[model samples]
Target: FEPQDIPLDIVYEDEDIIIINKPRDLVVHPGAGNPDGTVLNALLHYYPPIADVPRAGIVHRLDKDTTGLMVVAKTVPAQTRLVESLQRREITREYEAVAIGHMTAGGTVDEPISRHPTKRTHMAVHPMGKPAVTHYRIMEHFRVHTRLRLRLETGRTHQIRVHMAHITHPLVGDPVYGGRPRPPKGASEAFISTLRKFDRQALHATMLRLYHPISGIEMEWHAPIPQDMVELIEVMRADFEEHKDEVDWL
Candidate 1:
């Protein structure tokens, strides 16, 4: 594959692994219509030595819009052990999302998820699906929305998105799920427009913890909320401040 000079938000790198703070709308792998301008292409440009590693050593994927930190192994053995760690549920991944609705408290969603029966690009909670567990903490409150920090026990496809939607509090701006941008009553025009303009899922992989495949050293990495998401949160805060008691965040 030809190397592309796509800008990367690299956080840390060593001989065995690279921690990338992926930005919004960046594809993790080159596939289908996305033949270039992907994280894999950029990786080749930044570190051509990884070309021989499987899939450019990408260990996990964040959907196009869910920006966050990801691990890329630079060696084949590192990739193998990293994959094994993930399969063994030894790695920890945390995500922060602006979900629609006022959640009273944190909770765990233990559900099964699988591809949608009719919708080709959607996943849903179904009895025949694979087991998925997501534990979410209420980070903050809004009159009509809630900020959540979620941890995944099983890394299934769209696990957080599907599980949150199943519980009736889908992530904000997630058009694939329950994403009807329902602005609260008496919302300011700016607030409404800002929420509307957040065209992608308001989700970010904020923290990741794992052990080095080769060195067996535990390490952690964190990526702050992206600018767009931070701005979205500020907008919500302004709107909620305008009418704190008008609606109880139940």
Candidate 2:
């Protein structure tokens, strides 16, 4: 894909680093099925110097379909510092998600996660894999769904999705982790239709808090839920209100 054809919404930038509000469906870097049209490719076109740094100085990543704020370093030293911070868990990353089952309360999922034994592209909780931790709190509750605020202690591949699914409340619209779509009993056709049309995982990296790699100054950034997720939430909220008193399991 042509980097010039894609629009980049740069949030903050300086001589050492650049932060962006990355839109969904954009890959972070070039890989097997996605050879181009990634955020790194766009960075190379917009900021030529980034080509010299690894992964365009991206310290961490959100899934291809996840939307949120991200930081890209402009210099090698900055990149190193940022990477070190991430390794030390100094960077705070919080996410907002819509999970399928109603969570009675917030809790932590400290489990080992590794590639699925059979499904090569998928991840699952296993006894031999590296440790991964995810802490989540309920933000709101619906009849058959729950909104959550989640924080990561380890950045394992698809950690949140795997952990949530492990607890039997996989994220909504997550084709890989979220199981077969089952509309709530007595649910409206519109609710079922929305679930069917909401194809991407309902997850977003909503906030980032960390120190500036170069200056060591604390910094934080926030990205509001994307339009599609917001719309989904709206529908869920309406559905909840309509069915709150009727559903025995709500």
Q: What is the TM-score of each candidate against the true structure?
A: 0.94, 0.94
lDDT of each residue in 6-84, candidate 1, tens digit only: 9888899888999999888798887766888899999999999899999989988888888898899999999999999
Error of 1 at 41 (Å): 1.5
For every candidate in turn, the CA RMSD to the true structure comes to 2.6, 2.6
TM-score, cand. 1 vs. native: 0.94
The lDDT values for all models are 0.89, 0.87
Clashes of each: 0, 0
RMSD score of candidate 2 (Å): 2.6
Report the CA-based lDDT of candidate 1 relative to the real structure: 0.89
**lDDT digits (tens) for residues 1-250 of candidate 2:** 3344567888889889888888888988777788998888888889877778877788888888888888888999999999999999998988999999877999999999988989878999999999998999999998889999999889888999889999999889898996447788867787888888888888998898889988899999988999988988998998988876667765
Worst 10 residues of 2 by lDDT: 1-10
Candidate 1: regions farther than 4 A off: 245-250
